Amino acid sequence: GSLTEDGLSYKEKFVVRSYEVGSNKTATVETIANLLQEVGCNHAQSVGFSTDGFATTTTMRKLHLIWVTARMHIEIYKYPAWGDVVEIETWCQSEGRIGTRRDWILKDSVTGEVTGRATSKWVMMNQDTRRLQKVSDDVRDEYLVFCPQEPRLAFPEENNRSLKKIPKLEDPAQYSMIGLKPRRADLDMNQHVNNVTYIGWVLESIPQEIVDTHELQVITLDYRRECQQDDVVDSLTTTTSDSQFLHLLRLSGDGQEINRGTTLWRKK
Amino acid sequence: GSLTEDGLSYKEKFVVRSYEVGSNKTATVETIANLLQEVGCNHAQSVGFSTDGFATTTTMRKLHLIWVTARMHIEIYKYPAWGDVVEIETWCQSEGRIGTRRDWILKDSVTGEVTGRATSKWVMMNQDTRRLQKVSDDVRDEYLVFCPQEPRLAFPEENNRSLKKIPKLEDPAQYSMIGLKPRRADLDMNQHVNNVTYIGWVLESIPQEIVDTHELQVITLDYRRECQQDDVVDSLTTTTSNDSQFLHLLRLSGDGQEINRGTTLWRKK
Ligand SMILES: CC(C)(C)c1cn2cccnc2n1
Ligand SMILES: CC(C)(C)c1cn2cccnc2n1
16 A cells, blocks of 8 residues: 555555455455545555544544545446455545545556546534534645645546435335344444445345346445434335436434435346 | 465465454454454465365365354454554364364564464365265365374363353343344355354344453354344343353344354453
């Protein structure tokens, strides 16, 4: 792992592990999601940001402010197989006072070809009250120095899947996985549920026959609210179509919305 | 990752990842368990065994036989922190017609000190009928060549914790975590539940206050039956004890069929 010559992006190589693959012997979409966040943490550590908080500036800690994921978008062309080396390059960019955006390019270490790409949208929030608030000028000066000033987008294309408004799934759902609880392995170092568990919980309502005959090409996920340690989640799916699905994660009780998203699958 | 000079053991170094640690910022016991199985797979791959199954010889595939975990024993002195490099050395040894044993030594890459150690007991079984059998002579000649012939035990000691008979938890249990289902992330490449998920499911019945004030020093787990994708598990715990001991039991939430039993030992922080 290391920063590029300009110190404006970071690269890391990962060997795919035995327990990180599914039935095809290729990395799962949660393994990829985990590698994206690990290379993101390493990029922030390599530019001065200390442990406890992810990329929280000196002003952010003083004011009890954290960066939170609002959206995650992932497109995979080829899933690296068990034993293969995947090289991921990541960088962060400012989007004015709306928030910040972090992008990734997944490549095959042997061929040099792009096998996948991802984009995430982060917003600033008070860790205690959970209130959003715009990006303050004083905090911008602190992190802008680590970001390229010119646009560098993993998803440049006019009208692409990463910015499309996601609708709310209507009842009754076509498919469903009810009673999902997180365990200690689903929690991060700060005792919150890691954003990767939501990806897995969304995919639990996808029927096994679709998973066996298709490969996940695209996934877009909107994070609305966090699931607490003692909360139970219900996963709902409906085919909207390649196969497309509209997804919805909600609390098993009150029916409070925690996540919404879409997936696109290709026939093998 | 590479075999030692004699080709009778294997070593690999691992950097501890951000998502692999708990509240203390040190690797969880499931992260360690995962690293032990990964270095075990890499050792078998480096000595000729194909990707298909784990260490299944040419005769084993012909007769639809596989190696299955019967017992797992793990002792941790220091949990490596996020960013630290942990070096693990592993090897396999025969235990006559009973089956095989695989051992591991966890070390700090910087200090060279032993920070942990583990031992597992494997038995031979038919893939389809699920019936156990002794290790055949023909099968033994095929894998004995990769094992040191002299004893090499991670847990040598006269009466150590790795061989102690585990009792069955009596009802009512003191603590419990009900309704545990595996998800796709809990399954391996062959669609079975990973043996590491059982470790996590056992620890779900341990109260949060014990986890917050103590560190897991020892864990012994006996694998009796596998949990299917559509099975629901119940985790039961009872304190049996400065150190805290617990008796554990995993069973199917329906019929109450026993799938796992074990013990843990925790020391105060
Ligand atoms: C490039 C640095 C490390 C300043 C940064 C800040 N970020 C906020 C949210 C997401 N990624 C981020 N990366
Ligand atoms: C050293 C080799 C690759 C022969 C081997 C066989 N095993 C059976 C059970 C557990 N580990 C094992 N390793």
